[PDB]
Structures are given as C-alpha cells and as structure tokens.
Design a protein around this motif. Structure first.
Motif, PDB file in Angstrom:
ATOM      1  N   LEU A  83      -9.592   7.258  -9.600  1.00 11.91           N
ATOM      2  CA  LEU A  83      -8.561   6.294  -9.245  1.00 11.91           C
ATOM      3  C   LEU A  83      -7.596   6.072 -10.402  1.00 11.91           C
ATOM      4  CD1 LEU A  83     -10.695   3.547  -7.484  1.00 11.91           C
ATOM      5  CD2 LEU A  83      -9.367   5.313  -6.365  1.00 11.91           C
ATOM      6  N   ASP A  84      -6.545   6.879 -10.445  1.00 12.69           N
ATOM      7  CA  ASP A  84      -5.441   6.591 -11.344  1.00 12.69           C
ATOM      8  C   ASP A  84      -4.137   6.599 -10.561  1.00 12.69           C
ATOM      9  OD1 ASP A  84      -5.524   9.315 -10.900  1.00 12.69           O
ATOM     10  OD2 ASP A  84      -5.218   9.888 -12.985  1.00 12.69           O
ATOM     11  N   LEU A  85      -3.144   5.861 -11.050  1.00 13.01           N
ATOM     12  CA  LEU A  85      -1.934   5.635 -10.269  1.00 13.01           C
ATOM     13  C   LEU A  85      -0.926   6.766 -10.394  1.00 13.01           C
ATOM     14  CD1 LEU A  85      -3.239   2.809  -9.826  1.00 13.01           C
ATOM     15  CD2 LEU A  85      -1.167   1.811 -10.802  1.00 13.01           C
ATOM     16  N   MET A  86      -1.257   7.839 -11.109  1.00 11.82           N
ATOM     17  CA  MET A  86      -0.421   9.029 -11.087  1.00 11.82           C
ATOM     18  C   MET A  86      -0.791   9.993  -9.978  1.00 11.82           C
ATOM     19  SD  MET A  86       1.925   8.691 -12.910  1.00 11.82           S
ATOM     20  CE  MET A  86       2.412   7.253 -13.826  1.00 11.82           C
ATOM     21  N   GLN A  87      -1.703   9.612  -9.084  1.00 11.95           N
ATOM     22  CA  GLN A  87      -1.872  10.351  -7.843  1.00 11.95           C
ATOM     23  C   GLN A  87      -0.826   9.976  -6.809  1.00 11.95           C
ATOM     24  OE1 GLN A  87      -4.065  12.883  -7.362  1.00 11.95           O
ATOM     25  NE2 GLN A  87      -4.611  12.593  -9.520  1.00 11.95           N
ATOM     26  N   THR A  88      -0.076   8.903  -7.039  1.00 13.15           N
ATOM     27  CA  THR A  88       1.019   8.515  -6.163  1.00 13.15           C
ATOM     28  C   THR A  88       2.142   9.532  -6.273  1.00 13.15           C
ATOM     29  OG1 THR A  88       2.042   7.154  -7.863  1.00 13.15           O
ATOM     30  CG2 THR A  88       0.443   6.106  -6.415  1.00 13.15           C
ATOM     31  N   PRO A  89       2.767   9.913  -5.164  1.00  7.40           N
ATOM     32  CA  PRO A  89       3.888  10.853  -5.237  1.00  7.40           C
ATOM     33  C   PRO A  89       5.101  10.207  -5.889  1.00  7.40           C
ATOM     34  CG  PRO A  89       2.874  10.885  -3.066  1.00  7.40           C
ATOM     35  CD  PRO A  89       2.331   9.690  -3.777  1.00  7.40           C
ATOM     36  N   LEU A 101       0.560  15.324 -19.239  1.00  7.19           N
ATOM     37  CA  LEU A 101      -0.763  14.853 -18.848  1.00  7.19           C
ATOM     38  C   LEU A 101      -1.256  13.801 -19.830  1.00  7.19           C
ATOM     39  CD1 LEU A 101      -0.536  17.777 -17.328  1.00  7.19           C
ATOM     40  CD2 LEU A 101      -2.949  18.026 -17.897  1.00  7.19           C
ATOM     41  N   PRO A 102      -1.299  12.533 -19.395  1.00  7.42           N
ATOM     42  CA  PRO A 102      -1.700  11.458 -20.311  1.00  7.42           C
ATOM     43  C   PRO A 102      -3.198  11.429 -20.578  1.00  7.42           C
ATOM     44  CG  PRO A 102      -1.254  10.553 -18.152  1.00  7.42           C
ATOM     45  CD  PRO A 102      -0.881  12.010 -18.083  1.00  7.42           C
ATOM     46  N   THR A 103      -3.640  10.422 -21.329  1.00  7.61           N
ATOM     47  CA  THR A 103      -5.033  10.290 -21.729  1.00  7.61           C
ATOM     48  C   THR A 103      -5.847   9.844 -20.515  1.00  7.61           C
ATOM     49  OG1 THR A 103      -4.057   9.564 -23.801  1.00  7.61           O
ATOM     50  CG2 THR A 103      -6.412   9.455 -23.687  1.00  7.61           C
ATOM     51  N   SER A 104      -7.170   9.982 -20.562  1.00  4.62           N
ATOM     52  CA  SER A 104      -8.051   9.602 -19.460  1.00  4.62           C
ATOM     53  C   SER A 104      -8.149   8.079 -19.407  1.00  4.62           C
ATOM     54  CB  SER A 104      -9.427  10.240 -19.627  1.00  4.62           C
ATOM     55  OG  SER A 104      -9.335  11.652 -19.587  1.00  4.62           O
ATOM     56  N   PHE A 105      -7.129   7.440 -18.838  1.00  2.94           N
ATOM     57  CA  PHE A 105      -7.215   6.034 -18.476  1.00  2.94           C
ATOM     58  C   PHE A 105      -6.898   5.881 -16.993  1.00  2.94           C
ATOM     59  CE2 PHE A 105      -2.649   5.990 -18.825  1.00  2.94           C
ATOM     60  CZ  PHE A 105      -2.347   6.634 -20.004  1.00  2.94           C
ATOM     61  N   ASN A 106      -7.675   5.038 -16.324  1.00  2.00           N
ATOM     62  CA  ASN A 106      -7.717   4.996 -14.870  1.00  2.00           C
ATOM     63  C   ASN A 106      -8.377   3.692 -14.429  1.00  2.00           C
ATOM     64  OD1 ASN A 106     -10.289   5.657 -15.733  1.00  2.00           O
ATOM     65  ND2 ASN A 106     -10.417   7.584 -14.624  1.00  2.00           N
ATOM     66  N   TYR A 107      -8.669   3.586 -13.136  1.00  2.00           N
ATOM     67  CA  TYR A 107      -9.317   2.422 -12.548  1.00  2.00           C
ATOM     68  C   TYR A 107     -10.708   2.750 -12.020  1.00  2.00           C
ATOM     69  CZ  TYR A 107      -4.935  -0.153 -12.853  1.00  2.00           C
ATOM     70  OH  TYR A 107      -3.802  -0.776 -13.307  1.00  2.00           O
ATOM     71  N   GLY A 108     -11.377   3.717 -12.633  1.00  2.00           N
ATOM     72  CA  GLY A 108     -12.688   4.128 -12.176  1.00  2.00           C
ATOM     73  C   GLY A 108     -12.608   5.274 -11.190  1.00  2.00           C
ATOM     74  N   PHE A 119       0.822  -1.201   0.000  1.00  7.52           N
ATOM     75  CA  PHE A 119       0.000   0.000   0.000  1.00  7.52           C
ATOM     76  C   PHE A 119       0.858   1.255   0.000  1.00  7.52           C
ATOM     77  CE2 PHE A 119      -2.990  -3.069   1.843  1.00  7.52           C
ATOM     78  CZ  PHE A 119      -4.094  -2.832   1.050  1.00  7.52           C
ATOM     79  N   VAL A 120       0.423   2.239  -0.780  1.00  9.46           N
ATOM     80  CA  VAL A 120       1.015   3.569  -0.783  1.00  9.46           C
ATOM     81  C   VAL A 120      -0.119   4.577  -0.631  1.00  9.46           C
ATOM     82  CG1 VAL A 120       1.083   3.612  -3.339  1.00  9.46           C
ATOM     83  CG2 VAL A 120       2.514   5.189  -2.027  1.00  9.46           C
ATOM     84  N   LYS A 121       0.069   5.565   0.237  1.00  6.92           N
ATOM     85  CA  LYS A 121      -0.993   6.529   0.463  1.00  6.92           C
ATOM     86  C   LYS A 121      -0.904   7.665  -0.540  1.00  6.92           C
ATOM     87  CE  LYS A 121      -1.059   9.338   3.913  1.00  6.92           C
ATOM     88  NZ  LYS A 121      -1.124   9.836   5.312  1.00  6.92           N
ATOM     89  N   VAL A 122      -2.067   8.168  -0.928  1.00 13.30           N
ATOM     90  CA  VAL A 122      -2.152   9.364  -1.752  1.00 13.30           C
ATOM     91  C   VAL A 122      -2.984  10.380  -0.996  1.00 13.30           C
ATOM     92  CG1 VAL A 122      -1.904   8.095  -3.889  1.00 13.30           C
ATOM     93  CG2 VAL A 122      -4.171   8.578  -2.999  1.00 13.30           C
ATOM     94  N   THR A 123      -2.853  11.639  -1.380  1.00 14.25           N
ATOM     95  CA  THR A 123      -3.705  12.665  -0.804  1.00 14.25           C
ATOM     96  C   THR A 123      -5.072  12.625  -1.481  1.00 14.25           C
ATOM     97  OG1 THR A 123      -3.970  15.065  -0.489  1.00 14.25           O
ATOM     98  CG2 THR A 123      -2.428  14.354  -2.273  1.00 14.25           C
ATOM     99  N   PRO A 124      -6.144  12.345  -0.753  1.00 19.10           N
ATOM    100  CA  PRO A 124      -7.451  12.231  -1.389  1.00 19.10           C
ATOM    101  C   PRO A 124      -8.100  13.594  -1.545  1.00 19.10           C
ATOM    102  CG  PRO A 124      -7.667  11.722   0.907  1.00 19.10           C
ATOM    103  CD  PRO A 124      -6.205  12.003   0.679  1.00 19.10           C
ATOM    104  N   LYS A 125      -9.117  13.634  -2.395  1.00 19.77           N
ATOM    105  CA  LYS A 125      -9.960  14.811  -2.488  1.00 19.77           C
ATOM    106  C   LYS A 125     -11.031  14.731  -1.411  1.00 19.77           C
ATOM    107  CE  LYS A 125      -7.663  16.150  -6.108  1.00 19.77           C
ATOM    108  NZ  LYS A 125      -8.344  16.510  -7.381  1.00 19.77           N
ATOM    109  N   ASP A 126     -11.962  15.682  -1.443  1.00 26.03           N
ATOM    110  CA  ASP A 126     -12.997  15.702  -0.417  1.00 26.03           C
ATOM    111  C   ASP A 126     -14.040  14.619  -0.658  1.00 26.03           C
ATOM    112  OD1 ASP A 126     -11.893  17.699   1.142  1.00 26.03           O
ATOM    113  OD2 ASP A 126     -12.820  19.303  -0.034  1.00 26.03           O
ATOM    114  N   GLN A 127     -14.672  14.614  -1.831  1.00 23.66           N
ATOM    115  CA  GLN A 127     -15.625  13.549  -2.108  1.00 23.66           C
ATOM    116  C   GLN A 127     -15.177  12.638  -3.241  1.00 23.66           C
ATOM    117  OE1 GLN A 127     -19.484  15.301  -2.688  1.00 23.66           O
ATOM    118  NE2 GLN A 127     -19.753  15.757  -0.509  1.00 23.66           N
ATOM    119  N   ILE A 128     -14.974  13.186  -4.432  1.00 22.26           N
ATOM    120  CA  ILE A 128     -14.759  12.372  -5.624  1.00 22.26           C
ATOM    121  C   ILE A 128     -13.267  12.152  -5.821  1.00 22.26           C
ATOM    122  CG2 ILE A 128     -15.071  12.228  -8.108  1.00 22.26           C
ATOM    123  CD1 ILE A 128     -17.582  13.970  -7.742  1.00 22.26           C
ATOM    124  N   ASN A 129     -12.866  10.881  -5.897  1.00 20.40           N
ATOM    125  CA  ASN A 129     -11.470  10.474  -6.051  1.00 20.40           C
ATOM    126  C   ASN A 129     -11.368   9.618  -7.309  1.00 20.40           C
ATOM    127  OD1 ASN A 129     -10.148  11.687  -3.781  1.00 20.40           O
ATOM    128  ND2 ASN A 129     -11.267  10.249  -2.483  1.00 20.40           N
TER     129      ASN A 129
END
Lengths: 220, 46, 184, 220, 220, 46, 46
Positions: C51-57, C133-140, C39-49
């Motif tokens: 899920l893409d792995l470029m939020q990792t520092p 900034l890459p294309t909109s690909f993510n994990y939902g 597990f690696v922690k990311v800084t979350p937003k308030d409600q909507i997060n």
C-alpha cells in the motif's frame, strides 16, 4: 456488547411519497444568487385566484353572443371541473391533479359591445335534485344575480359551494352520475341593439377555494 | 418545507445535503391575490 | 501595473485598475484536504498489494493532485473487494507476517470491506520525489486469496513544496471534448 | 423488547464521495512531530495566485518577439483554460479537474530586451459576439491597457470575468462552440531598435478567481 | 412509524483488532479475590528496563575472554535487534513482535576476573555510512567510553539512538541492507594478568526506549 | 483499558459483560524500573 | 475538515480513528498570496 436492534419486516421499502431524504454524495456546493427574482409564486391557488382564464363555448370561442328570438337561454353547464366549458381554464388544469375540492368558483362576465348596445343578463345556480330551468322566470327562484351593461363592463359572480359533503369530487370515472353539483345557468333578460356582440367570460378560484388529495391520472 | 416530515434533525450537515444559497446586495402572486378587490363598486340597497 | 518582474515577488492586478470591482470568491473546492478526500481506484495485484500512494495513476485527479506536492501527510482509507480473508500488516513488517490472522484481518462480508488505516511510516512526511523510484515508505501491505478491486482515500491530507501540473497538450488551438448535453 | 428500526432500501451503498468515515482496526498510533515544516499550502488557488507560470506560443517558447512589418498583431488567443497558449500553466492544470470557474485571470508581461531597445504594447479584451480585431485602432474601443518599457520591466493586466452567467465552463466536450468567453489580444504599438528581442509572459489566478465542481476526466 | 437506518456496505465485518466487545451470555459471575499478588507487571518495557539479560558470543557463552596478542578487538556487532549477539535477550524477544523502535539501549559490562587481574576496556559507537573501525585508536574518534576494573565491577554504557528517522526498523525482510543503524564495538585497551578470565555482558532497554506497531510474523 | 475505543457507554451492565472482582482485607516492575540508579558512582571531572 | 459532513460525534475515540500528532519544541502560500502587491507603482492620472 453493541446495541441490539430488531430489523422489522414491512418497513424500509421505497415509497415514492415518503417524508425521508436521500444520502448526499457531493458536498459544499454554493448556488448563484437568486434573491428578488420577479414572478415568484409559492402556491398554485395563488395564481389560480389572481389570474382568471377564459371559458369555452360551441365554436371554440371565449364569448357568447346575444340571440334575438323567443328562447333566451344563453349558456348552461355543470359544476364539474371536468366540464367542457371549464376545460381550457387554469382551474381545471389544476383540478385534474387532485381528487377533491371545496369552496367558491368565481365567474367574470365582461361585455365587449359598442356604446349604443345595451343588455341585461342573469346568472343562476340550479342545485342538484331536479332538472335545471329553461326560462329566467323559472330561474328567478334560485340563487341568482342580475346585472346590466354600463360604464363598468365586468361583473363578477361567486358560485357558492352547496353540497351535502364538505368536499366534492373533481371528476367521474366513466360510469354514471347524472349532473351532480348542479348547473350554472346564464340567461339574458333584455337587449337593445346588441345583435351579435360578444360577452366574454373568465373563470377563477374563489377566496375560500381549496383543492386537496393529489393524484396523477394522465394527460399532462 | 416540502414533502418532509421527520422530527429528528438530519444526520448530515446542510453543506452536504443541499446546495447553499447566496444573497446579493409566495411571493408576487400572493401579494397579487391578496390585493384582489372583494367588495362592491356601487351603492348597495337592501 | 508595472513592477520589477525579475524580483519574483508575487504581484497581482485587479480589474479596479481599469474601473472594475473585484468580487467575492468561494474556494472550498481547491483546498487540499477536501479534494484529496475521495476514493481512487488502482490496479491491484493478485494476492499481495503493497500500500503506497504511487500506485495511483498520474492522470487521475488524486494521482496528479497528489504528485503536485513534494511532501505529504495522510491517514489512509481502503476499500477492497476480495476473496477469502483480507490481512493488513504495518510499515516495516515482513511478508510472512501477511500469513497470520493476529495481524488486523477483516473477514469476508459481501460486497466489499472498507477499513481505516493510520500513518505507520517512520518518517515525519512521505515523498512524491526522492533524489537518492523513491525509498521503501508506504502504508503497509494487504493480501487475500485474490484481490479484485482496490480503492484509496487520503484523509487529513497535508501537502508541502508544490511541483508542476501538466494539462493535455492539444493539436489544434483548443483541446475540445464532448461535454455532456441533451440531444434535443 | 429491543429497539425497532426500518432498514431502508436505497440507502447504505458505497458512494466514492460520501461524508462518512471507515471503521478503525489498529488503535493509538502516535505520529512523528510535523509542526513548522516549510512549504505548507492548504489550498491550490493560493499557490495558483502566488506563483505565475509561463504561457506557450508557436515554436514552444514562453516569449513573443517583436515583428517589424505592416501587420502589428503580436499574439491572440481565447479565454478557454483549455486553450493551447494556456496549456502549460498551473492554472489550466488545476482547471482540468473542475468543470466551472469564475473571476479574474492575471497576465504578466515582462520585457527582456536590452537597455537601448524600447517598445510599446497594448493588451485588449474582445468580448464574445463578434469577430476579434486585427488592428490596435480597432481594439482601442475594447477594454484595453497600453504600456511601454522602462525601469520597471513587468506589467500585470487583469483580464476580467464578463459573462452572462456567473460561472463559466473550463472546456468544450468536442462538438462545437465558436470561441466563447471571448479573446485575449496582444498588440504592439511602437518599437525602437527592439528587433528580435523577447517579451515573456506569465499567467496566474486573480484575487477573486474561484474554481468549483471537481471532476476527473483523464490525462494526469 | 419506526426509526429508519441505512445499513452501510463495507461496515460490520469481523476485524481481529477492532475496539468493539462481544455480547454477553452468562451474567453476574464474581471472581475470587486477587488484590496484592506479587510480581505484577503492566507493561513489557517495565520488565525490559528493570531486568537485563545476557548476550551471546561465539561458542554460545554470555562472556568474552581477554585475548593477549597484537589485535585487540574484543567483540563487534550491529544495532539490529535481530542480530545474533542480541538473539537470546528479552529485548529482542519483545522486538520480534513490533516493527519499529526508538531510543537508548543499555549494555552492562561486569567483570568476573580475580583480584590480581586488571583490565581496561573501551566501548564505541560507529554510526552507519562507512566501515567500522578495527583499532581503538581509530575508534577514539567515535562516541566512546573507556573504563577499568576495580572495586565496582559493572559498567553501564548507553548506546544512543542516532538516526535520520525518529523510528527504526527491528529487522530486514531478507533481501539487502548493509549494516544499517551502525555497529557496537567492544575493544580492550590494556590488561594485567587477565589471561583467560571472563567479562560477561547484559543488555536492557534504556529510559527513553519505546517500541511500537505490533506484528506477528512467526517463531514464538 | 485494553484494545477498546468506544466513547458510548456499554449497552449491557458490568455484571453481565465481565467477571466482577472481589477485594480482600504496573505494578512491581514499574516500581523496580523506576527505582533504577541513573547517575554516576564516582567523581565526575570535566 | 476534509470531505466529512456528519453532525453526530464519532462513535470511536480519536486514538483509534486517526493517527495522533506530536508537537515539538495554508500556510506559507497563504501568506505569500496575501502579501501580493495589488495597487499601482506610478502616479495615477485621471
């Protein structure tokens, strides 16, 4: 549905001597090689039997000197492992962390006088029930062993386990026992020009010595 | 081996529970205690 | 060992060139699937997060070793501390779909919620660098009433076409740290 | 009744490196096909061994130029992976996320001078315990290798793992070590019309290089 | 004792799409017989393939009428399932509950003019990347199919799945895509006394049409 | 069959988990979709 | 394969735990690292 279980009350608390193991967090760690290192011991009674350690007498010495007077008592103590004579041994250092013991205690009497100094000694076992003897003629009716000095300097005597119960305590709390498990009585019989030489004595565990019920009280 | 008394095998593998040993190429005081001279040195009479 | 250094063939030299012997290696800590499965922690937003792995520092272990690759494949594992009910939508879903509980919704149980999410992208692999900034690909995406902590974990990780790693640049000759040790 | 269990205290907390997996919520998802994609690597030490990366010197250059004066020391640094010369390599970029390493470190010395420029270089390993040499005649008593330029431009030298322990740290915290794991000493012996040309040097992992105990400190 | 378990944190919360089942409360209930009922369907794509549904054009009609003027464009739309022409189909009614699709989309063009009215039509696929054609001579360089009316009134054309990725989205959120997945272009070539008759068109799923990742957004 | 993915058999019997079916004496649109005419009607040239 | 160390098989099926792979029709740097020239180029004396 799913499998039903009954979470029982009284079970699951952390006990400091449980046979359970903790959950891992950090896997596949390989150690450096460690085979055939010297000095491996797996049981503390193996090094208690294989390595005798010195006793203590008045003046903080591991020896006893031959007196030349009318009274011929040389040393006398108890079969408490918490005795003052046994207090610097490795056997008492093990026995302070256990509540019960059983078996034989070996005492090693080796003689460090010159070649023109001769002596004859007597070791006796006084069982508990009456007061211990003061004279070797009174201790001749015990379990005793007599030896004299010569080419072979060390004599090993095996103090036996005689008790009503098959396990004996390693201490008294503070209150009162008299001198239970009896006495060890060291006497000298004769000496020729042995005035002031030393007889040093070691102590170790016997062959059937066993020591059970671990405990922590204090004093590392 | 130590103070463990479960009869059911462990849920985790050995790679994650303990550190794994490595070979190259108890145990001395057991042999030193077993090699102790136990009899008598002289000639036993009676 | 001499060679043609410009041909860029891999050339290794051993200690046996000067009378040594090469020893055995255990490399179970530098393989990709093991080192990224944590597990690696990311800084979350308030409600909507999202899920893409470029939020990792990029200075973390999973962030930098993730950005070592050009392409990657992983399933995802998330652990969320949240208030209210946490809702997940897959890749390509609208954001109003985050307001419906028919989508996978884990109800609140203390202290956190740990759930496994599959690979839902329409691409065969994802990308750490996109040429375009890459294309909109993510994990939902997930949302709750508020999200306080958000952890990722890459499982069955595969990496393709490696890219540079950069250590910290020291000011003096060696980068010195305070390695943990007893005082006495 | 039902099956009784004891919910144990101390067990079940979320550990960030546990071997357990999460519960699913969204089933039977089939991926797009992904077989035979180019550039697959399964271990970071495979690309650390197969791909050497440049070193850094003063002036931020991957090369070192041949000096023509009385002192013939060309480069000198440490076997810290946290050294300033190693700081732009991929091997240090891996080694910042692990606490321990072991094994051989390969250095690749390839020569980019003209065909009328010749040189002869010497690489030496100074083990820790005394201060490193300043002269090639003093470093001739080390583990060294000497080579000269010709048709084959690259020379690979394998810095060996010599240590007391079988694993070595990848950094110091901040406080104090002197220069532990020794020094790498690059010397030039002779040169003919090589005034101001470049010798570039790469670094990579050896064949038995291993790197263990993952850690996260900072600086991605 | 009893069996120890570790109640793990993060596990056991109610997820609305878990593969687990609930616990029963009311047992041994036998249903009325239900075998061989008519109209059984097990998959929604089976009735999406077996049953085509009408398209929508301007004026809310399932047909398109033949114009008689210089410009010969008859219909043109997108390969969004969220398009306005596709909006009354069963295929879009399925596709609103899924985020991704793949495969072929069949269009059925059947002609409802009289026996003295003839026509010749052309269907073309403009891939995304440039603006779609306005003339059949410009669309002749696409993937197209041309047919004319006769004894057989219906012509089925299979719009293929051409994309970079192997799965395509079924909508845009709101923000911006231009007209991705291209255009469907219906052109007429010739007509003889077909002034004002109708060409009705159905749409259905292809043989390799697939539709995955279920979602709920709104609008039942 | 549906959205169930456990590999361990159920703790409860089938009589208590579901309603039991009864015989007397998928599935039409699968046969209706599989009977779709796929080829060409005329004579294919070139 | 990764950081998993349980010896008991998973309660859930493979269809629900992970995404399923699809075939069509490690791993390069392992072959590129294994094909490294390790010996000497010239003629070794002494």
């Amino acid at each position: 549905g799913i499998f039903p279980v009954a979470c029982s009350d009284g079970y699951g608390g952390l006990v400091t001597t449980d046979p359970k193991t903790a959950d891992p967090a950090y896997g596949k760690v390989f150690n450096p090689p460690r085979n055939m290192l010297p000095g491996r011991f797996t049981n503390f009674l193996d090094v208690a039997e294989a390595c005798p350690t010195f006793l203590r007498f008045e003046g903080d010495v591991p020896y006893v000197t031959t007196k030349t007077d009318s009274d011929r008592i040389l040393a006398q103590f108890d079969l408490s492992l918490a005795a003052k004579h046994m207090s610097n041994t490795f056997l008492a250092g093990l026995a302070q962390y256990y509540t019960q013991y059983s078996g034989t205690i070996n005492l090693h009497f080796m003689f460090t006088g010159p070649t023109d100094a001769k002596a004859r000694y007597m070791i006796a076992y006084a069982p508990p029930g009456m007061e211990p003897p003061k004279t070797p003629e009174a201790a001749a009716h015990c379990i005793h062993a007599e030896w004299d000095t010569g080419l072979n300097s060390k004599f090993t005597f095996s103090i036996p386990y005689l008790s009503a119960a098959d396990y004996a305590y390693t201490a008294s709390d503070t209150a009162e026992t008299t001198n239970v498990q009896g006495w060890v009585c060291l006497f000298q019989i004769t000496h020729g020009k042995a005035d002031g030489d030393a007889l040093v004595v070691l102590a170790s565990a016997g062959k059937d010595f066993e020591l059970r019920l671990p405990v922590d009280a204090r004093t590392q | 081996s130590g103070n463990t008394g479960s009869i059911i095998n462990n849920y985790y593998m050995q790679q994650y529970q303990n550190s794994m040993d490595t070979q190259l190429g108890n145990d001395w005081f057991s042999k030193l205690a077993s090699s102790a001279f136990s009899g008598l040195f002289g000639a036993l009479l009676a | 060992t001499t060679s043609a250094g410009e041909s860029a063939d891999p050339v290794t030299a051993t200690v046996e060139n000067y009378g040594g012997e090469t020893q055995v290696q255990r490399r179970q800590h530098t393989d990709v699937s093991f080192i990224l499965d944590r597990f690696v922690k990311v800084t979350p937003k308030d409600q909507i997060n999202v899920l893409d792995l470029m939020q990792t520092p990029a200075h973390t272990l999973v962030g930098a070793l993730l950005r070592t690759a050009t392409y990657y494949f992983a399933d995802l594992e998330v652990a969320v501390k949240h208030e209210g009910n946490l809702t997940w939508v897959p890749n390509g879903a609208p954001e109003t779909a985050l307001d419906n509980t028919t989508n996978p919704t884990a109800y609140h149980k203390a202290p956190l919620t740990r759930l496994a999410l599959p690979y839902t992208a329409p691409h065969r692999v994802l990308a750490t660098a996109y040429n375009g900034l890459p294309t909109s690909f993510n994990y939902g995406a997930i949302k709750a009433t508020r999200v306080t902590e958000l952890l990722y974990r890459m499982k069955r990780a595969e990496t393709y076409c490696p890219r540079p790693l950069l250590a910290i640049h020291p000011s003096e000759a060696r980068h010195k740290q305070k390695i943990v040790a007893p005082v006495k």
